[PDB]
């Protein structure tokens, strides 16, 4: 069961998808005064789902950069590219 968090990394490519979309969203939030990035809106049978992303997973890094060191200019540049790497932190689904 869910006790400690688990951290894992994935590398995803648009050429492995049907329609050049990974099938998830990233939520930029302020949570108790702290800026965080979360996985959200994971499409069933989409690439992100295949790679084991879950809504609510915290994104710790994108392309080897800490989430709290990103800005919107970097975000847009990163997700304009044909591929992207993520470090995420999750709980077991159950």
């Amino acid at each position: 069961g869910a006790m400690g968090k688990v951290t894992h990394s994935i590398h995803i490519e648009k050429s492995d998808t049907a329609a050049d979309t990974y099938g998830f969203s990233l939520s930029s939030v302020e949570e108790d005064g702290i800026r965080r990035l979360y996985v959200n809106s994971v499409k069933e049978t989409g690439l992100a789902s295949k790679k084991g992303l879950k809504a609510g997973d915290e994104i710790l890094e994108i392309n080897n950069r800490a989430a709290d060191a990103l800005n919107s200019s970097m975000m847009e540049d990163f997700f304009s590219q044909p591929s992207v790497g993520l470090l995420v932190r999750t709980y077991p689904e159950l």
């Binding site: 969203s25 959200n40 997700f79």
Partner: peptide
């Protein structure tokens, strides 16, 4: 408090 959603 969500201030942006990126759909990728």
């Amino acid at each position: 408090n969500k201030d942006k959603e990126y759909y990728v």
